């Protein structure tokens, strides 16, 4: 058919991909309180 | 329009190992505007021409080339 079929000099990942939660912050966090 | 020239010419300065029969005798078709120059080039080597009748024909015409 079409099928170009070439070679290559990169890649070959062994997938891992763990992921996470994503929680929003309430608009009141004390802007002023950080340290000393 | 063109001519059918035939001519014979030797070369003077050298002796050549190649055969040169086609170079010492011609039967060439030459067009009309090169012939003002091509005829004069055989004069410089001094070769004789013989039969110079035109092959394209129609002499004395004005237009149509």
């Amino acid at each position: 058919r079409f099928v170009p079929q070439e070679k290559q000099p990169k890649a070959g990942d062994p997938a891992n991909f763990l992921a996470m939660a994503k929680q929003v912050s309430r608009p009141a966090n004390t802007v002023t309180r950080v340290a000393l | 329009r063109s001519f059918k020239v035939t001519a014979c010419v030797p070369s003077q300065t050298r002796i050549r190992t190649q055969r040169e029969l086609q170079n010492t005798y011609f039967t060439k078709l030459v067009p009309y505007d090169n012939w003002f120059r091509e005829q004069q080039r055989i004069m410089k080597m001094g070769g004789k021409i013989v039969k110079v009748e035109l092959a394209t024909g129609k002499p004395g015409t004005n237009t149509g080339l």
């Binding site: - | 092959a55 394209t56 129609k58 149509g64 080339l65």
Partner: protein, 161 residues
């Protein structure tokens, strides 16, 4: 080399004077036939390989000239023999578009009297090959345009043999 257009122009200057009304009617007789002879050039420019293919296949493709002996045995003496045929067909388009048979006198018919004789080439095959070639073009361009090209095409027969 001149056409039918500068045929009357060349006769105007041999006589010197300006062309008169009878010479005008000779020039404008082309213009009544000009729009139809270009219609032949449309369809003959397309299938120019088709006309020289089957004209071989009419009487020159299974023949004694194509079998050992002959003049189309090898492929090289073939390679001029078909090469002459479209050269007649191209210059027939050159003749039929100009009205004059004088174009192919000096470009085609100049050496064909003796080069076919000196090379041992049968003209009687090629005269047989063109009268079948003449009839198939008039079917393909139409009979209104196929007639007028034939007298430039039978002009080739008078210069060939």
């Amino acid at each position: 080399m001149q056409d039918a257009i500068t045929s009357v122009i060349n006769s105007s200057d041999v006589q010197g004077k300006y062309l008169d009304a009878s010479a005008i009617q000779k020039l404008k007789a082309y213009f009544a036939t000009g729009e139809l002879r270009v219609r032949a050039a449309t369809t003959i420019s397309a299938n120019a390989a088709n006309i020289v293919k089957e004209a071989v296949a009419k009487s020159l493709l299974y023949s004694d000239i194509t079998r050992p002996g002959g003049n189309m045995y090898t492929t090289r003496r073939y390679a001029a023999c078909i090469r002459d045929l479209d050269y007649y067909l191209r210059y027939a388009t050159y003749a039929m578009l100009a009205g004059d048979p004088s174009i192919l006198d000096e470009r085609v018919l100049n050496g064909l009297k003796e080069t076919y004789n000196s090379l041992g080439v049968p003209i009687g095959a090629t005269v047989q090959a063109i009268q079948a070639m003449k009839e198939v073009t008039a079917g393909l361009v139409g009979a209104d345009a196929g007639k007028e090209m034939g007298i430039y095409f039978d002009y080739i027969c008078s210069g060939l043999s």
